Write an enzyme that holds these catalytic residues in place. Structure first.
Site, PDB file in Angstrom:
ATOM      1  N   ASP A   1      10.377  12.953  10.820  1.00  0.00           N
ATOM      2  CA  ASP A   1       9.988  12.966   9.411  1.00  0.00           C
ATOM      3  C   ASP A   1       8.556  13.476   9.262  1.00  0.00           C
ATOM      4  O   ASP A   1       7.716  12.836   8.631  1.00  0.00           O
ATOM      5  CB  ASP A   1      10.188  11.562   8.831  1.00  0.00           C
TER       6      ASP A   1
ATOM      7  N   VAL B   1       0.798  -1.218   0.000  1.00  0.00           N
ATOM      8  CA  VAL B   1       0.000   0.000   0.000  1.00  0.00           C
ATOM      9  C   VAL B   1       0.834   1.272   0.000  1.00  0.00           C
ATOM     10  O   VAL B   1       0.323   2.329  -0.397  1.00  0.00           O
ATOM     11  CB  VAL B   1      -1.006   0.013   1.175  1.00  0.00           C
TER      12      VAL B   1
ATOM     13  N   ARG C   1       8.731  -0.518   2.856  1.00  0.00           N
ATOM     14  CA  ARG C   1       7.495  -0.870   2.171  1.00  0.00           C
ATOM     15  C   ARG C   1       6.440  -1.214   3.208  1.00  0.00           C
ATOM     16  O   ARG C   1       6.716  -1.947   4.168  1.00  0.00           O
ATOM     17  CB  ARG C   1       7.694  -2.062   1.226  1.00  0.00           C
ATOM     18  N   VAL C   2       5.227  -0.710   3.002  1.00  0.00           N
ATOM     19  CA  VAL C   2       4.116  -0.943   3.919  1.00  0.00           C
ATOM     20  C   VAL C   2       3.106  -1.833   3.217  1.00  0.00           C
ATOM     21  O   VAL C   2       2.559  -1.450   2.176  1.00  0.00           O
ATOM     22  CB  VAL C   2       3.470   0.380   4.360  1.00  0.00           C
TER      23      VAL C   2
ATOM     24  N   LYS D   1       5.379  -3.469   8.038  1.00  0.00           N
ATOM     25  CA  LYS D   1       6.342  -2.567   7.427  1.00  0.00           C
ATOM     26  C   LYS D   1       7.673  -3.291   7.331  1.00  0.00           C
ATOM     27  O   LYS D   1       8.217  -3.752   8.341  1.00  0.00           O
ATOM     28  CB  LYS D   1       6.476  -1.265   8.224  1.00  0.00           C
TER      29      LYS D   1
ATOM     30  N   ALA E   1      11.452   5.796   0.966  1.00  0.00           N
ATOM     31  CA  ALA E   1      12.855   5.571   0.646  1.00  0.00           C
ATOM     32  C   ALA E   1      13.395   4.300   1.289  1.00  0.00           C
ATOM     33  O   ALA E   1      14.289   3.660   0.722  1.00  0.00           O
ATOM     34  CB  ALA E   1      13.697   6.768   1.089  1.00  0.00           C
ATOM     35  N   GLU E   2      12.883   3.930   2.470  1.00  0.00           N
ATOM     36  CA  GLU E   2      13.479   2.871   3.271  1.00  0.00           C
ATOM     37  C   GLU E   2      12.517   1.754   3.636  1.00  0.00           C
ATOM     38  O   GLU E   2      12.977   0.695   4.083  1.00  0.00           O
ATOM     39  CB  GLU E   2      14.065   3.441   4.575  1.00  0.00           C
TER      40      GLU E   2
HETATM   41  C1  LIG Z   1      -2.277   3.179   4.219  1.00  0.00           C
HETATM   42  C2  LIG Z   1      -2.891   3.037   5.625  1.00  0.00           C
HETATM   43  N1  LIG Z   1      -1.826   2.949   6.630  1.00  0.00           N
HETATM   44  C3  LIG Z   1      -2.058   2.414   7.905  1.00  0.00           C
HETATM   45  O1  LIG Z   1      -3.130   2.024   8.300  1.00  0.00           O
HETATM   46  C4  LIG Z   1      -0.759   2.446   8.625  1.00  0.00           C
HETATM   47  C5  LIG Z   1      -0.425   2.020   9.896  1.00  0.00           C
HETATM   48  C6  LIG Z   1       0.897   2.162  10.295  1.00  0.00           C
HETATM   49  C7  LIG Z   1       1.848   2.729   9.473  1.00  0.00           C
HETATM   50  C8  LIG Z   1       1.498   3.174   8.204  1.00  0.00           C
HETATM   51  O2  LIG Z   1       2.445   3.717   7.400  1.00  0.00           O
HETATM   52  C9  LIG Z   1       0.181   3.013   7.785  1.00  0.00           C
HETATM   53  C10 LIG Z   1      -0.491   3.365   6.507  1.00  0.00           C
HETATM   54  O3  LIG Z   1      -0.019   3.912   5.536  1.00  0.00           O
HETATM   55  C11 LIG Z   1      -3.812   4.219   5.965  1.00  0.00           C
HETATM   56  C12 LIG Z   1      -5.125   4.155   5.195  1.00  0.00           C
HETATM   57  C13 LIG Z   1      -5.821   2.845   5.368  1.00  0.00           C
HETATM   58  O4  LIG Z   1      -7.030   2.720   5.340  1.00  0.00           O
HETATM   59  N2  LIG Z   1      -5.014   1.747   5.562  1.00  0.00           N
HETATM   60  C14 LIG Z   1      -3.635   1.723   5.598  1.00  0.00           C
HETATM   61  O5  LIG Z   1      -3.035   0.664   5.617  1.00  0.00           O
END
Ligand SMILES: C[C@@]1(N2C(=O)c3cccc(O)c3C2=O)CCC(=O)NC1=O
Lengths: 173, 229
Positions: free
Chosen positions: B145, B22, B29-30, B43, B26-27
Protein backbone atom coordinates in the site's frame (compact mmCIF):
# COMPACT_ATOMS: atom_id res chain seq x y z
CA UNK A 1 16.98 1.08 48.55
CA UNK A 2 13.83 2.20 46.75
CA UNK A 3 11.04 0.50 44.85
CA UNK A 4 9.78 1.41 41.42
CA UNK A 5 6.04 1.04 40.81
CA UNK A 6 4.05 1.62 37.64
CA UNK A 7 0.37 1.20 36.89
CA UNK A 8 -0.48 -0.95 33.87
CA UNK A 9 -2.18 1.31 31.31
CA UNK A 10 -4.41 -1.43 29.84
CA UNK A 11 -5.15 -2.89 33.31
CA UNK A 12 -5.41 0.27 35.39
CA UNK A 13 -6.25 -1.48 38.67
CA UNK A 14 -2.92 -3.37 38.43
CA UNK A 15 0.34 -2.00 39.84
CA UNK A 16 3.74 -3.50 38.98
CA UNK A 17 6.47 -3.22 41.62
CA UNK A 18 10.22 -3.65 40.98
CA UNK A 19 12.75 -4.26 43.77
CA UNK A 20 16.50 -4.48 43.11
CA UNK A 21 19.13 -6.06 45.39
CA UNK A 22 22.91 -6.44 45.30
CA UNK A 23 25.39 -8.48 47.35
CA UNK A 24 22.76 -11.20 47.70
CA UNK A 25 23.98 -14.21 49.66
CA UNK A 26 20.96 -16.54 49.55
CA UNK A 27 19.95 -16.66 45.89
CA UNK A 28 19.68 -20.44 46.10
CA UNK A 29 17.12 -20.32 48.91
CA UNK A 30 15.23 -17.47 47.21
CA UNK A 31 15.07 -19.54 44.02
CA UNK A 32 13.68 -22.52 45.96
CA UNK A 33 11.04 -20.37 47.68
CA UNK A 34 9.83 -18.86 44.42
CA UNK A 35 9.66 -22.36 42.95
CA UNK A 36 7.62 -23.56 45.93
CA UNK A 37 5.61 -20.33 45.67
CA UNK A 38 6.18 -19.28 49.29
CA UNK A 39 7.76 -16.10 47.92
CA UNK A 40 5.15 -14.42 45.73
CA UNK A 41 6.62 -12.80 42.64
CA UNK A 42 9.08 -13.15 39.75
CA UNK A 43 12.80 -13.45 40.51
CA UNK A 44 14.63 -12.05 37.48
CA UNK A 45 18.30 -11.78 36.48
CA UNK A 46 18.93 -8.01 36.43
CA UNK A 47 22.10 -8.38 34.36
CA UNK A 48 19.99 -8.75 31.19
CA UNK A 49 17.44 -5.98 31.86
CA UNK A 50 18.24 -2.73 30.03
CA UNK A 51 15.26 -0.63 31.12
CA UNK A 52 12.15 -1.01 33.30
CA UNK A 53 10.10 -0.71 30.09
CA UNK A 54 11.32 -4.24 29.26
CA UNK A 55 9.78 -5.48 32.54
CA UNK A 56 6.56 -3.53 32.07
CA UNK A 57 6.04 -4.87 28.54
CA UNK A 58 6.58 -8.43 29.78
CA UNK A 59 4.18 -7.79 32.68
CA UNK A 60 1.49 -6.28 30.46
CA UNK A 61 1.47 -9.29 28.16
CA UNK A 62 1.55 -11.73 31.09
CA UNK A 63 -1.47 -10.13 32.81
CA UNK A 64 -3.28 -10.03 29.48
CA UNK A 65 -2.92 -13.77 28.91
CA UNK A 66 -3.51 -14.46 32.61
CA UNK A 67 -6.93 -12.80 32.43
CA UNK A 68 -7.78 -14.50 29.14
CA UNK A 69 -6.71 -17.86 30.55
CA UNK A 70 -4.18 -18.33 27.71
CA UNK A 71 -0.79 -18.18 29.39
CA UNK A 72 1.91 -20.37 27.89
CA UNK A 73 3.16 -21.25 31.42
CA UNK A 74 1.32 -22.19 34.60
CA UNK A 75 1.62 -19.02 36.72
CA UNK A 76 1.71 -15.27 36.28
CA UNK A 77 5.13 -15.17 37.96
CA UNK A 78 6.72 -17.52 35.44
CA UNK A 79 4.83 -15.94 32.53
CA UNK A 80 6.46 -12.56 33.20
CA UNK A 81 9.93 -14.11 33.12
CA UNK A 82 9.13 -16.12 30.01
CA UNK A 83 7.95 -13.04 28.13
CA UNK A 84 11.42 -11.48 28.51
CA UNK A 85 13.08 -14.11 26.34
CA UNK A 86 13.28 -13.66 22.54
CA UNK A 87 12.55 -17.41 22.12
CA UNK A 88 9.61 -19.66 22.84
CA UNK A 89 11.59 -22.33 24.73
CA UNK A 90 10.20 -22.13 28.25
CA UNK A 91 12.92 -23.92 30.22
CA UNK A 92 15.68 -21.96 28.47
CA UNK A 93 13.88 -18.68 29.07
CA UNK A 94 13.47 -19.43 32.76
CA UNK A 95 17.15 -20.43 33.07
CA UNK A 96 18.47 -17.34 31.25
CA UNK A 97 16.12 -14.71 32.68
CA UNK A 98 15.39 -16.26 36.10
CA UNK A 99 17.87 -16.41 38.97
CA UNK A 100 20.34 -19.16 39.75
CA UNK A 101 21.89 -20.17 43.06
CA UNK A 102 25.16 -18.32 42.43
CA UNK A 103 23.74 -14.89 41.51
CA UNK A 104 24.56 -11.90 43.70
CA UNK A 105 22.13 -9.43 42.09
CA UNK A 106 18.37 -10.05 41.96
CA UNK A 107 15.31 -8.20 40.67
CA UNK A 108 11.94 -9.01 42.26
CA UNK A 109 8.83 -8.12 40.25
CA UNK A 110 5.29 -8.53 41.52
CA UNK A 111 1.85 -7.28 40.52
CA UNK A 112 -1.06 -6.25 42.75
CA UNK A 113 -4.70 -5.64 41.81
CA UNK A 114 -1.89 -6.43 49.11
CA UNK A 115 1.54 -7.92 49.81
CA UNK A 116 3.57 -7.11 52.94
CA UNK A 117 6.62 -5.66 51.18
CA UNK A 118 8.71 -5.36 54.33
CA UNK A 119 8.46 -9.10 54.94
CA UNK A 120 9.32 -9.83 51.31
CA UNK A 121 12.40 -7.61 51.55
CA UNK A 122 13.47 -9.20 54.85
CA UNK A 123 13.74 -12.57 53.05
CA UNK A 124 16.65 -11.33 50.89
CA UNK A 125 20.13 -11.65 52.40
CA UNK A 126 21.39 -8.64 50.50
CA UNK A 127 21.20 -4.89 50.14
CA UNK A 128 18.30 -3.20 48.38
CA UNK A 129 19.20 -0.45 45.91
CA UNK A 130 17.42 2.10 43.77
CA UNK A 131 16.41 0.93 40.32
CA UNK A 132 18.50 3.84 39.10
CA UNK A 133 21.38 1.41 39.82
CA UNK A 134 20.13 -1.06 37.20
CA UNK A 135 22.37 0.19 34.34
CA UNK A 136 25.50 -0.46 36.44
CA UNK A 137 24.35 -4.10 36.91
CA UNK A 138 23.28 -4.74 33.32
CA UNK A 139 25.87 -6.67 31.27
CA UNK A 140 25.56 -5.43 27.68
CA UNK A 141 27.64 -8.27 26.23
CA UNK A 142 25.30 -10.84 27.79
CA UNK A 143 22.28 -8.84 26.58
CA UNK A 144 23.54 -8.79 23.00
CA UNK A 145 24.28 -12.54 23.13
CA UNK A 146 20.87 -13.63 24.48
CA UNK A 147 18.87 -11.39 22.16
CA UNK A 148 21.20 -11.95 19.18
CA UNK A 149 21.21 -8.21 18.57
CA UNK A 150 23.10 -6.98 15.52
CA UNK A 151 24.88 -3.78 14.59
CA UNK A 152 22.22 -3.39 11.88
CA UNK A 153 19.49 -3.08 14.50
CA UNK A 154 21.59 -0.69 16.59
CA UNK A 155 22.04 1.57 13.54
CA UNK A 156 18.30 2.41 13.38
CA UNK A 157 17.42 2.39 17.07
CA UNK A 158 18.34 1.52 20.62
CA UNK A 159 19.16 -1.87 22.05
CA UNK A 160 15.93 -1.61 24.07
CA UNK A 161 13.96 -1.05 20.84
CA UNK A 162 15.37 -4.20 19.26
CA UNK A 163 14.73 -6.22 22.44
CA UNK A 164 11.12 -5.07 22.70
CA UNK A 165 10.40 -5.73 19.05
CA UNK A 166 11.59 -9.31 19.57
CA UNK A 167 9.67 -9.84 22.80
CA UNK A 168 6.44 -8.50 21.39
CA UNK A 169 6.28 -10.56 18.19
CA UNK A 170 7.72 -13.96 19.16
CA UNK A 171 4.17 -15.31 19.61
CA UNK A 172 3.34 -14.82 15.93
CA UNK A 173 6.59 -16.26 14.57
CA UNK B 1 -13.89 -18.18 27.66
CA UNK B 2 -16.51 -15.88 26.16
CA UNK B 3 -16.80 -13.83 29.36
CA UNK B 4 -13.03 -13.38 29.65
CA UNK B 5 -12.77 -12.52 25.96
CA UNK B 6 -15.58 -9.99 26.32
CA UNK B 7 -13.86 -8.42 29.33
CA UNK B 8 -10.59 -8.07 27.39
CA UNK B 9 -12.33 -6.36 24.46
CA UNK B 10 -14.02 -3.97 26.88
CA UNK B 11 -10.62 -3.24 28.44
CA UNK B 12 -9.29 -2.44 24.97
CA UNK B 13 -12.22 -0.16 24.16
CA UNK B 14 -11.69 1.65 27.48
CA UNK B 15 -7.97 2.15 26.79
CA UNK B 16 -8.62 3.46 23.26
CA UNK B 17 -11.18 5.93 24.57
CA UNK B 18 -8.35 7.61 26.50
CA UNK B 19 -6.23 8.09 23.36
CA UNK B 20 -6.27 10.72 20.61
CA UNK B 21 -7.53 9.49 17.25
CA UNK B 22 -4.95 10.70 14.74
CA UNK B 23 -5.64 8.78 11.52
CA UNK B 24 -8.31 6.62 9.95
CA UNK B 25 -8.08 4.49 6.81
CA UNK B 26 -10.43 2.02 5.19
CA UNK B 27 -9.57 -0.70 7.73
CA UNK B 28 -7.70 0.80 10.68
CA UNK B 29 -7.95 3.62 13.18
CA UNK B 30 -4.66 4.95 14.55
CA UNK B 31 -4.69 6.36 18.10
CA UNK B 32 -1.85 8.09 19.92
CA UNK B 33 -0.90 8.34 23.58
CA UNK B 34 1.45 6.76 26.14
CA UNK B 35 2.07 3.07 26.72
CA UNK B 36 3.98 2.34 29.94
CA UNK B 37 5.70 5.71 29.79
CA UNK B 38 6.63 5.63 26.07
CA UNK B 39 5.03 7.64 23.26
CA UNK B 40 2.89 5.08 21.44
CA UNK B 41 0.37 4.60 18.67
CA UNK B 42 -2.26 1.89 18.88
CA UNK B 43 -3.77 0.71 15.61
CA UNK B 44 -7.20 -0.89 15.84
CA UNK B 45 -8.41 -2.90 12.88
CA UNK B 46 -12.08 -2.14 13.33
CA UNK B 47 -15.01 -4.16 11.99
CA UNK B 48 -17.62 -2.88 9.57
CA UNK B 49 -21.16 -3.88 10.50
CA UNK B 50 -22.21 -4.76 6.95
CA UNK B 51 -19.61 -7.51 6.43
CA UNK B 52 -19.84 -11.06 7.78
CA UNK B 53 -18.54 -10.98 11.39
CA UNK B 54 -16.48 -14.16 11.01
CA UNK B 55 -14.77 -12.67 7.95
CA UNK B 56 -14.17 -9.36 9.72
CA UNK B 57 -12.49 -11.05 12.68
CA UNK B 58 -10.29 -13.06 10.30
CA UNK B 59 -9.40 -9.98 8.25
CA UNK B 60 -8.58 -7.89 11.30
CA UNK B 61 -6.42 -10.66 12.72
CA UNK B 62 -4.64 -11.28 9.43
CA UNK B 63 -3.68 -7.65 8.91
CA UNK B 64 -2.57 -7.29 12.54
CA UNK B 65 -0.37 -10.38 12.26
CA UNK B 66 1.11 -9.34 8.93
CA UNK B 67 1.99 -5.85 10.15
CA UNK B 68 3.61 -7.19 13.32
CA UNK B 69 5.66 -9.66 11.28
CA UNK B 70 6.68 -6.98 8.76
CA UNK B 71 7.83 -4.59 11.47
CA UNK B 72 9.98 -7.29 13.08
CA UNK B 73 11.44 -8.14 9.69
CA UNK B 74 12.22 -4.46 9.07
CA UNK B 75 13.97 -3.94 12.41
CA UNK B 76 16.15 -7.05 12.04
CA UNK B 77 17.02 -5.95 8.48
CA UNK B 78 17.92 -2.41 9.54
CA UNK B 79 14.94 -0.84 7.74
CA UNK B 80 13.60 2.05 9.79
CA UNK B 81 9.99 1.43 10.85
CA UNK B 82 8.11 1.58 14.16
CA UNK B 83 8.94 -1.04 16.76
CA UNK B 84 6.11 -3.18 18.11
CA UNK B 85 5.36 -2.99 21.84
CA UNK B 86 2.36 -5.32 22.18
CA UNK B 87 -0.09 -7.18 19.96
CA UNK B 88 -3.62 -7.73 21.36
CA UNK B 89 -5.24 -10.50 19.36
CA UNK B 90 -8.39 -10.34 21.48
CA UNK B 91 -9.07 -6.86 20.04
CA UNK B 92 -6.93 -6.71 16.88
CA UNK B 93 -4.95 -3.81 18.31
CA UNK B 94 -1.28 -3.28 17.50
CA UNK B 95 0.75 -1.16 19.93
CA UNK B 96 3.68 0.59 18.30
CA UNK B 97 6.24 3.32 18.89
CA UNK B 98 5.09 6.83 17.89
CA UNK B 99 7.37 8.48 15.33
CA UNK B 100 7.23 11.73 17.28
CA UNK B 101 7.27 15.09 15.54
CA UNK B 102 7.47 13.48 12.10
CA UNK B 103 5.88 14.72 8.88
CA UNK B 104 4.66 12.66 5.96
CA UNK B 105 6.65 12.70 2.75
CA UNK B 106 3.39 13.86 1.20
CA UNK B 107 3.24 16.97 3.38
CA UNK B 108 6.95 17.65 2.91
CA UNK B 109 6.73 17.49 -0.88
CA UNK B 110 3.56 19.58 -1.01
CA UNK B 111 5.04 22.24 1.28
CA UNK B 112 8.17 22.35 -0.88
CA UNK B 113 6.16 22.69 -4.09
CA UNK B 114 4.17 25.49 -2.43
CA UNK B 115 7.19 27.51 -1.27
CA UNK B 116 10.10 26.74 -3.61
CA UNK B 117 7.68 26.44 -6.58
CA UNK B 118 9.95 23.76 -8.10
CA UNK B 119 10.90 20.13 -7.33
CA UNK B 120 14.65 20.51 -7.96
CA UNK B 121 15.46 20.33 -4.24
CA UNK B 122 13.59 17.03 -3.75
CA UNK B 123 16.04 14.80 -5.66
CA UNK B 124 17.92 14.00 -2.43
CA UNK B 125 14.66 12.92 -0.80
CA UNK B 126 13.85 10.76 -3.82
CA UNK B 127 17.28 9.13 -3.68
CA UNK B 128 16.78 8.26 0.01
CA UNK B 129 13.38 6.71 -0.66
CA UNK B 130 14.99 4.69 -3.44
CA UNK B 131 17.59 3.28 -1.05
CA UNK B 132 15.00 2.48 1.62
CA UNK B 133 12.56 0.71 -0.68
CA UNK B 134 15.39 -1.14 -2.41
CA UNK B 135 16.41 -2.53 0.98
CA UNK B 136 12.82 -3.47 1.75
CA UNK B 137 12.31 -5.32 -1.51
CA UNK B 138 15.71 -7.02 -1.19
CA UNK B 139 14.30 -8.54 2.02
CA UNK B 140 11.38 -9.84 -0.09
CA UNK B 141 8.98 -7.57 1.85
CA UNK B 142 6.15 -6.24 -0.32
CA UNK B 143 4.57 -3.24 1.42
CA UNK B 144 1.23 -3.57 -0.40
CA UNK B 145 0.00 0.00 0.00
CA UNK B 146 2.82 2.42 -0.83
CA UNK B 147 1.96 6.14 -0.83
CA UNK B 148 3.81 9.25 0.23
CA UNK B 149 1.62 9.25 3.37
CA UNK B 150 3.00 5.87 4.48
CA UNK B 151 6.54 7.25 4.62
CA UNK B 152 7.51 9.59 7.47
CA UNK B 153 10.39 12.03 7.89
CA UNK B 154 11.71 11.87 11.49
CA UNK B 155 13.25 15.03 12.98
CA UNK B 156 15.53 16.74 12.32
CA UNK B 157 13.64 17.00 9.02
CA UNK B 158 16.53 17.99 6.74
CA UNK B 159 18.44 14.81 7.60
CA UNK B 160 15.91 12.89 5.46
CA UNK B 161 15.30 10.15 8.05
CA UNK B 162 12.65 8.06 6.29
CA UNK B 163 10.48 5.77 8.45
CA UNK B 164 8.12 3.32 6.73
CA UNK B 165 4.68 2.71 8.27
CA UNK B 166 1.39 0.83 7.83
CA UNK B 167 2.30 -2.70 6.72
CA UNK B 168 -1.15 -4.24 7.18
CA UNK B 169 -1.36 -5.16 3.47
CA UNK B 170 2.25 -6.43 3.31
CA UNK B 171 3.41 -9.92 2.44
CA UNK B 172 6.61 -11.82 1.71
CA UNK B 173 7.44 -12.46 -1.93
CA UNK B 174 10.57 -12.86 -4.04
CA UNK B 175 8.55 -12.51 -7.27
CA UNK B 176 9.64 -9.52 -9.39
CA UNK B 177 6.06 -9.05 -10.51
CA UNK B 178 4.94 -8.45 -6.93
CA UNK B 179 7.73 -5.89 -6.48
CA UNK B 180 6.82 -4.25 -9.79
CA UNK B 181 3.19 -3.92 -8.67
CA UNK B 182 4.38 -2.43 -5.36
CA UNK B 183 6.29 0.23 -7.34
CA UNK B 184 3.45 0.75 -9.82
CA UNK B 185 1.06 1.47 -6.94
CA UNK B 186 3.56 3.94 -5.48
CA UNK B 187 3.97 5.56 -8.89
CA UNK B 188 0.23 6.12 -9.39
CA UNK B 189 -0.19 7.45 -5.87
CA UNK B 190 2.84 9.67 -6.29
CA UNK B 191 1.91 11.19 -9.67
CA UNK B 192 -1.72 11.73 -8.70
CA UNK B 193 -0.96 13.31 -5.32
CA UNK B 194 2.08 15.34 -6.47
CA UNK B 195 1.38 16.55 -10.00
CA UNK B 196 4.30 17.82 -12.07
CA UNK B 197 6.99 16.20 -9.89
CA UNK B 198 8.08 13.64 -12.50
CA UNK B 199 11.77 14.45 -12.04
CA UNK B 200 11.40 13.38 -8.41
CA UNK B 201 10.01 9.98 -9.32
CA UNK B 202 12.68 9.63 -11.99
CA UNK B 203 15.35 10.17 -9.32
CA UNK B 204 13.61 7.65 -7.06
CA UNK B 205 13.72 4.98 -9.79
CA UNK B 206 17.37 5.66 -10.58
CA UNK B 207 18.32 5.24 -6.93
CA UNK B 208 16.20 2.11 -6.47
CA UNK B 209 17.82 0.55 -9.53
CA UNK B 210 21.33 1.29 -8.24
CA UNK B 211 20.54 0.27 -4.65
CA UNK B 212 18.68 -3.01 -5.17
CA UNK B 213 20.63 -6.16 -5.92
CA UNK B 214 17.92 -7.56 -8.21
CA UNK B 215 16.11 -4.56 -9.65
CA UNK B 216 16.53 -5.49 -13.33
CA UNK B 217 13.67 -8.05 -13.49
CA UNK B 218 11.58 -5.86 -11.16
CA UNK B 219 11.83 -2.77 -13.37
CA UNK B 220 10.96 -4.84 -16.44
CA UNK B 221 7.84 -6.06 -14.62
CA UNK B 222 7.04 -2.45 -13.70
CA UNK B 223 6.89 -1.63 -17.40
CA UNK B 224 4.65 -4.66 -18.02
CA UNK B 225 2.29 -3.76 -15.18
CA UNK B 226 2.06 -0.15 -16.38
CA UNK B 227 1.03 -1.25 -19.85
CA UNK B 228 -1.57 -3.72 -18.61
CA UNK B 229 -2.80 -1.28 -15.96
C1 LIG C 1 0.49 10.31 12.91
C2 LIG C 1 1.88 9.82 13.37
N1 LIG C 1 1.99 8.37 13.18
C3 LIG C 1 2.94 7.61 13.87
O1 LIG C 1 3.76 8.05 14.63
C4 LIG C 1 2.73 6.19 13.45
C5 LIG C 1 3.38 5.04 13.85
C6 LIG C 1 2.94 3.84 13.29
C7 LIG C 1 1.92 3.79 12.37
C8 LIG C 1 1.29 4.96 11.96
O2 LIG C 1 0.28 4.90 11.06
C9 LIG C 1 1.70 6.17 12.53
C10 LIG C 1 1.23 7.56 12.32
O3 LIG C 1 0.37 7.95 11.56
C11 LIG C 1 3.01 10.52 12.61
C12 LIG C 1 3.18 11.97 13.05
C13 LIG C 1 3.35 12.10 14.53
O4 LIG C 1 4.00 12.98 15.06
N2 LIG C 1 2.71 11.15 15.30
C14 LIG C 1 1.92 10.11 14.85
O5 LIG C 1 1.28 9.44 15.64
Amino acid sequence: HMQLTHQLDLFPECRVTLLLFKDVKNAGDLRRKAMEGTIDGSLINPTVIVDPFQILVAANKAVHLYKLGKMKTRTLSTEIIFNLSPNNNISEALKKFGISANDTSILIVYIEEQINQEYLISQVEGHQVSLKNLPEIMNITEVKKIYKLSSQEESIGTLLDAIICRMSTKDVL
Amino acid sequence: EAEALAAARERSSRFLSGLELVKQGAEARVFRGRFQGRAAVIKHRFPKGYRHPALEARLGRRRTVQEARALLRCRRAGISAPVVFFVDYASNCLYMEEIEGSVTVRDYIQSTMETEKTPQGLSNLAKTIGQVLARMHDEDLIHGDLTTSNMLLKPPLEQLNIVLIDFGLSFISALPEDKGVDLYVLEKAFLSTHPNTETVFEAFLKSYSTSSKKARPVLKKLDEVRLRG
